[PDB]
Amino acid sequence: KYDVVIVGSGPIGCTYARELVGAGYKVAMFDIGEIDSGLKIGAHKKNTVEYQKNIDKFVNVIQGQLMSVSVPVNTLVVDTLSPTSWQASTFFVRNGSNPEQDPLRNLSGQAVTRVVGGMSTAWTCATPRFDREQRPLLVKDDADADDAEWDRLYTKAESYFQTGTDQFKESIRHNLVLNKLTEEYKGQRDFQQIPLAATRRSPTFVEWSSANTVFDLQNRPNTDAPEERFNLFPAVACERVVRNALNSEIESLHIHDLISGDRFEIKADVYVLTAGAVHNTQLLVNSGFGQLGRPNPANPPELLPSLGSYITEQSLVFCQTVMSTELIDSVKSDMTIRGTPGELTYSVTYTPGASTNKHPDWWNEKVKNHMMQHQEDPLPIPFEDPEPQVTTLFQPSHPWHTQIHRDAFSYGAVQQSIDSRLIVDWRFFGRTEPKEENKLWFSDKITDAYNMPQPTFDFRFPAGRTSKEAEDMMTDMCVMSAKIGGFLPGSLPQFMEPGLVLHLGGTHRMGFDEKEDNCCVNTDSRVFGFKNLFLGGCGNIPTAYGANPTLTAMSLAIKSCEYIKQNFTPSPF
Amino acid sequence: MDIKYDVVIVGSGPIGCTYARELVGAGYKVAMFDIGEIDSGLKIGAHKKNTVEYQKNIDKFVNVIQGQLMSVSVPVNTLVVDTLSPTSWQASTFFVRNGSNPEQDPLRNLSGQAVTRVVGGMSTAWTCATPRFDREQRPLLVKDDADADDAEWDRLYTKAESYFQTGTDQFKESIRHNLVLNKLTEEYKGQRDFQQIPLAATRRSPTFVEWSSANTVFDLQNRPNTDAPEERFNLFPAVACERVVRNALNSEIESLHIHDLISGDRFEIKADVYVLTAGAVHNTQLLVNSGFGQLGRPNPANPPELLPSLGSYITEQSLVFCQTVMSTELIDSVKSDMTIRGTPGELTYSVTYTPGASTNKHPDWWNEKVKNHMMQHQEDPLPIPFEDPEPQVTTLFQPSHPWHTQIHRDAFSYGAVQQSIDSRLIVDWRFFGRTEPKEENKLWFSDKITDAYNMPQPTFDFRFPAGRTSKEAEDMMTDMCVMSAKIGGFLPGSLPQFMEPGLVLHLGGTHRMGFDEKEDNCCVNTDSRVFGFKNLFLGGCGNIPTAYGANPTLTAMSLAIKSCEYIKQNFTPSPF
Amino acid sequence: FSYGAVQQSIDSRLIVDWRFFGRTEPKEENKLWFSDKITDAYNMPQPTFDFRFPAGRTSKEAEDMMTDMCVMSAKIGGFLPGSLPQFMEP
Amino acid sequence: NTVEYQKNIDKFVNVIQGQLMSVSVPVNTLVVDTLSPTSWQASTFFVRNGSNPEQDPLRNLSGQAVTRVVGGMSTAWTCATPRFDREQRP
């Protein structure tokens, strides 16, 4: 028996933990996955010296933990088996595939992670705020009050994640790209550092934030927090919340301990679901909310008829570029270079402080030292120079988020032919209109690896604005990137597999009125009709958004915790 | 961090952990340093495959493996990229990029050789195959008394097996395992014996195996603790060990020079006993960075002062591979004992069998599983249950087939995972050749190029020796083709091939063992002591000086147990 | 004259090729010469190229050309996977 | 101009490829290290298979090819015959 139970130990469940453990509630958190970021529980797995010295390897860590949500039945023809090998006569259900899934209306890229810390063990840490156009209303009829409220929540969310915009400020590659784009779009678009949840520890190491940053996940009481109460239970699959007969309260949470095999009913005052956008929905549907099985408009749901409808997933376009000769020459614009490289006669110098210098003293010093210590190298950029981290944020005239950077989540084989210092990634992210026909549903027959109802997508990017902006977005990437360099062969401009972006929202969407706003939670993230059931995560977000959604889901979780503090009293210690 | 210990061990792989288990147990104040960090859950240095999620999604684990294997020597890239935009910065030469090694001849490399820097080392992701070597593959520990030599290795191997929890019955009730085992036993009746791959692993449930690791050998928890209140052990992760400092007389090690990667601070650690267990590549690197052997391109015209055999006579196994898709014959034989009423999914479908019937081809445990699968899943066209464990079959190295063999399913898949053919039907074949030690095959270190930790860049100069090594390698390929055909045809996309040299990760002989430094061309004696040094010991596969086909870790561990016996007799622990 | 594996999943009625062709400034240093030792298949001096697209106008136009192809093509449809915008082999 | 090719236009690329002979192919430096130990193998990237050792791979026109047939390349060409405007014309 606990005051609060939280399903999921991602960054959003950790937000609930930090708020509610902090205010003195007795909290239990269950996660279906296990501890594997080392001694700091739920921490970013990229925070090893080894991964940051070998960053091209990290993509493997991400791929290891990302399990595809719905894989349609495979129909690839293999007709060169030996005549002695066993072969089927049909494309039968094999290898975990989902026979419910139409392969042409899928988010083939969508995937889920089952580990303590969730996806924040592996994420890219981009945490931009949404502007009003992308953002749901928390107060209607008063835009200054709405703005004030979001600014308060976002500022709080940013302190939890340690969000900042200074961590790449002395990178030459970063500044080279930032300044070129600033100049080229002067007075049309503004560029800045991607806001990133991260603290720099040294010139060659960044401590990336994670769920662990929000809440350390240590059991309490402990020496540092002797008046607090928290228990984390990993390797526990939460399966159902049990409703009372009147559908006004949750009575227990049914769990299955994956190590012992035991099953229990846990009791709490407050039930918080933060299992991610796909798995929150699964749990809810397995508990008799919305509709199990293939959508049947003729058999309309008892509860939450909008559950798993109006799903949004962003369009994503991507390429990489190889830095222009002109930009590479400009790196060394302030330098005087004499003699020939590799001889005793060679010299590279600059005038410190000269207001005609195109670059600051710290840049010139690093170029100089590099050119002088590595005279065999043809490039002026230092070998350990950090990557670019540049964005121009969503605006009505360019309604897409942009990242101009180097991501550890590369999408094709890492090429080795072109020097890494030259390469920039471009990712532009489009917003998707919520439409009732776009659905996440759960089979009544097929089950997944944890014996829960199999997720199935029925999705296409909506015609009209969504698709028009997607293609405009592609053009914009092509136009903008060319200012920096030509496309890298093997990473030519393309749309990524639907869902690979992992910014799925709207599966259990928020709104003011259940019927009028076709939604499932109110602005306290409380499930309509239920006193004591709260959902957290990107599945709450009901709008078309282009920016990375995590900071916004966190802000909503902060507001939700405010309601919980006003309505439930912690038990005596 | 104390500055003074009884014993310091560089590296937290299973071999370092053997030294720790033996010397912490015996009362020595032990520190262990690892350049890598703690990542595998609450059990320090444990197998990463031991999660519910990986064992329900075993095909994802190849990502974990790939994520932690860092190539040792990548030659300068000479791929022509001639479709860059005319505005892009374009190379005039194939210059040194992306951590490539200009010392490395691309045609005399172990391009697949890789290293892991994490606490527990490579045992965090290995396959756990631990066979013993027979005489032919195995260095001598006793001269001129083969029976005493065998007795000494049995004693060592038995202990090493108990440390790793090696077993040969974890897969005894797998249908796929037995289907393969029985067909191969029958086909080679009176010619070759087949058994389960000896595996370092404990079965915990019908669907979960606790694979062994460094953590199995030694739990890597600091001591003293409640469970060991009189023991003294500290593990220091993210500590790059750079040099052992030799005294001027070249008779003792005086300190271990370390660099803490998090603080940036450097220290000189003092110990009575120094043990290097950094892997076959990195033990050699550390020795060469400390003045042993010869730094730079090999040069006879000035032989090294100390350990002139260091980094020569290196051995790496040839590895051949394919996968097969199970024959129609064998798959039909899975259900040979079943009585099947009517048609699947239809009302009067029943599948039954007679337990104990003498005419039954298979045991009751097999039929019960098949029956239950065919009845619970009548849509599925195969008789193999969905959760049936993988095959784990070998015919071990012999004089008439001088290669080790694994007929199995390895988490370490070599190409993209194929999804079209049902996984129940797929069997992997890996055959492993032995390589003659030759002085010309070398691991050396650049005197100019450095790696990511600023240590001298490893460089290989290697070819499979002509003569027996090469003859055997090609004969082994043919053997794999002929043997595999008895089970099924080749899986397209996994046709029979030699793997990139060194992908097998069984590199030996980089700091090889022998009796006499000069007559046996070696670096350590049979106590694993570096010649001429009182207090310096090397552990790991680099010790093994012979041409072996089987997986070497068990043998390296056995050497390490011997070495601890010498240490316990020659050094006294400090008072507690 | 198609340039990569011809794809069969997208109906060919939907497919349009875009080829934009840049002009290249003549530069003394851009050469075709013939070996005095190596011969071709008909025993004649083996042709050798020494060629880069000139910096300056030629390169600036080539990249602007690429941009114009991405901009114009989008009016008609999006890129076909496997025939994404690229410079072809010189 | 055959009924068969214009009914199967996708196949004509092979005609064109069959008669285009590359002008200058640089010595190949692809590393093939999975040969059987018994196979004969190279110690160096020697001149093989018609390659040109004079050719700098990085200053080439690798796509340049020639056709040796009566009618020359007009046996396979695309037939686009525009005029040059003054800007392009000698």
Ligand SMILES: Cc1cc2nc3c(=O)[nH]c(=O)nc-3n(C[C@H](O)[C@H](O)[C@H](O)COP(=O)(O)OP(=O)(O)OC[C@H]3O[C@@H](n4cnc5c(N)ncnc54)[C@H](O)[C@@H]3O)c2cc1C
């Ligand atoms: C490679 C990568 C890059 C990304 N980069 C960014 C970026 O830069 N910015 C950003 O805004 N977003 C990014 N994201 C997405 C971001 O990680 C998620 O939005 C965020 O982690 C969601 O938080 P959450 O707590 O709702 O869910 P999750 O992090 O998905 O965690 C939910 C959890 O609950 C668990 N669980 C699931 N089902 C059950 C169940 N039945 N019972 C018990 N527990 C259960 C899981 O095991 C898991 O820990 C990225 C994701 C990936 C993988």
Ligand SMILES: Cc1cc2nc3c(=O)[nH]c(=O)nc-3n(C[C@H](O)[C@H](O)[C@H](O)COP(=O)(O)OP(=O)(O)OC[C@H]3O[C@@H](n4cnc5c(N)ncnc54)[C@H](O)[C@@H]3O)c2cc1C
């Ligand atoms: C996927 C795969 C499958 C394998 N399969 C098996 C098989 O089934 N059976 C078989 O016998 N073996 C197999 N192996 C090989 C086996 O893992 C190794 O032989 C074994 O781990 C060697 O142990 P070790 O302790 O000598 O070194 P390692 O496990 O390599 O550990 C050495 C360590 O020292 C550290 N270190 C390195 N340099 C420094 C330094 N300068 N300072 C401080 N620390 C340092 C490392 O971080 C590391 O932890 C496999 C390996 C892989 C990766």
Ligand SMILES: Cc1cc2nc3c(=O)[nH]c(=O)nc-3n(C[C@H](O)[C@H](O)[C@H](O)COP(=O)(O)OP(=O)(O)OC[C@H]3O[C@@H](n4cnc5c(N)ncnc54)[C@H](O)[C@@H]3O)c2cc1C
């Ligand atoms: C697939 C393709 C598409 C094309 N599309 C177009 C198009 O749309 N537009 C256009 O303007 N251009 C196009 N071209 C280019 C056009 O084909 C050439 O510009 C044109 O054919 C050149 O004509 P030519 O007579 O100068 O040389 P070629 O057609 O090359 O003919 C030269 C000939 O001389 C021969 N020969 C070579 N050496 C010797 C020797 N030593 N002794 C004797 N004979 C010799 C040949 O065998 C050959 O028949 C295309 C080319 C091809 C292959």
Ligand SMILES: OC[C@H]1O[C@@H](O)[C@H](F)[C@@H](O)[C@H]1O
């Ligand atoms: O593909 C997952 C994506 O997640 C997004 O949030 C990141 F910003 C992208 O860079 C990418 O990593």
Ligand SMILES: OC[C@H]1O[C@@H](O)[C@H](F)[C@@H](O)[C@H]1O
């Ligand atoms: O390629 C690495 C190899 O290591 C060997 O020891 C294993 F036995 C093989 O199965 C394979 O995993």
